[PDB]
Design a protein around this ligand. Structure first.
Ligand SMILES: COc1cc2nc(N(C)C3CCCC3)nc(NC3CCN(C)CC3)c2cc1OC
Ligand SMILES: C[S@@+](CC[C@H](N)C(=O)[O-])C[C@H]1O[C@@H](n2cnc3c(N)ncnc32)[C@H](O)[C@@H]1O
Ligand SMILES: [Zn+2]
Ligand SMILES: [Zn+2]
Ligand SMILES: [Zn+2]
Ligand SMILES: [Zn+2]
Length: 269
């Protein structure tokens, strides 16, 4: 309905991300700090040694199969328009290694999609049943980079004592987490869908410290204007939270609704 905030990102993204609410009286969320890149709250010592970067020697646009950075990702998974290859493994995505400051290529090469930031028009809006959510203000073709899951990098030991685990993304590999509860970007508002339309992909850009992949959401199908974005939060989230609330995604594939939980519980016998 009417726009309550012109840009929740305070100008830190390539495009503004407005907030609207046509459902209830809740004002624009303001109990967190918007950040556009991951932050640290303890000593993490991400390995930023430029000599530890694997890098390419391309003098073209890194569209050839001899791009070392593409080879690290098995092959460069970006097409000429920056979208994931149509054979990209969406079920089990590979690690993507983008070009970096040690590569001989130019900053506009074809292997720098995620580091170039948000390009699609997104909107923070009030959903009917799931609080705030994020939807597209444009058609988004399948394979398009949407946004990064940005927040506070924390150790697994720190995550184990975090009281609010509603905004946690496990990185896995000596395992770390992104906590977007107190510091986060637009992705902290993306809800869970049992029939998701975006997938998280682990990406390396300016560093290649394998403890800290950056989490990039790409569309898993064509997305229509106005459609809510959502990914599969996974079973660790729902094993913990189903006791407190159930899924409202409304899909016929929904496996975390009260009915879905009760039906598997009845089948139990
Ligand atoms: C994706 O979603 C989640 C991920 C969660 N991940 C963790 N850890 C500890 C990571 C650390 C590395 C591997 C496992 N903990 C959670 N919760 C713990 C439960 C016990 N309390 C006292 C502390 C918080 C999580 C909850 C999630 O969603 C509800
Ligand atoms: C990362 S947040 C998403 C943004 C949240 N809706 C908000 O208003 O800030 C996760 C929380 O959103 C709600 N949520 C997300 N997906 C949901 C779903 N499929 N069904 C019910 N609640 C959901 C739950 O409260 C969940 O703990
Ligand atoms: Zn290259
Ligand atoms: Zn390169
Ligand atoms: Zn390059
Ligand atoms: Zn569901």
């Amino acid at each position: 309905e009417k726009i309550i905030c012109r840009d929740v990102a305070r100008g830190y993204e390539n495009v503004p991300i407005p907030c609207v609410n046509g459902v209830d009286g809740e004002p624009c969320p303001e109990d967190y700090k918007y950040i556009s890149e991951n932050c640290e709250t303890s000593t993490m010592n991400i390995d930023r040694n430029i000599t530890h970067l694997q890098h390419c020697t391309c003098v073209d646009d890194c569209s050839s199969s001899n791009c070392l950075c593409g080879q690290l990702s098995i092959r460069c998974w970006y097409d000429k328009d920056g979208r994931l290859l149509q054979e990209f493994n969406k079920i089990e995505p590979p690690l993507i290694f983008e070009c970096n400051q040690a590569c001989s290529c130019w900053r506009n090469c074809k292997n720098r999609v995620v580091q170039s930031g948000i390009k699609v028009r997104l909107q923070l809006y009030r959903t009917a049943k799931m609080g705030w959510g994020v939807r597209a203000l444009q058609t988004i073709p399948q394979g398009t980079f949407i946004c990064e899951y940005v927040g506070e990098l924390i150790s697994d030991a720190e995550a184990d004592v975090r009281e609010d685990d509603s905004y946690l993304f496990d990185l896995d590999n000596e395992v770390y987490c992104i906590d977007a509860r107190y510091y986060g970007n637009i992705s902290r508002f993306i809800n869970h869908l049992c029939d998701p339309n975006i997938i998280p992909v682990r990406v390396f850009m300016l560093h290649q410290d394998l403890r800290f992949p950056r989490i990039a959401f790409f569309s898993s199908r064509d997305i229509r204007t106005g459609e809510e974005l959502g990914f599969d939060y996974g079973d660790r989230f729902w094993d913990i939270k189903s006791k407190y609330f159930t899924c409202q995604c409304g899909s016929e594939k929904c496996k975390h609704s009260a009915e879905a939980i009760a039906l598997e519980q009845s089948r139990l016998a």
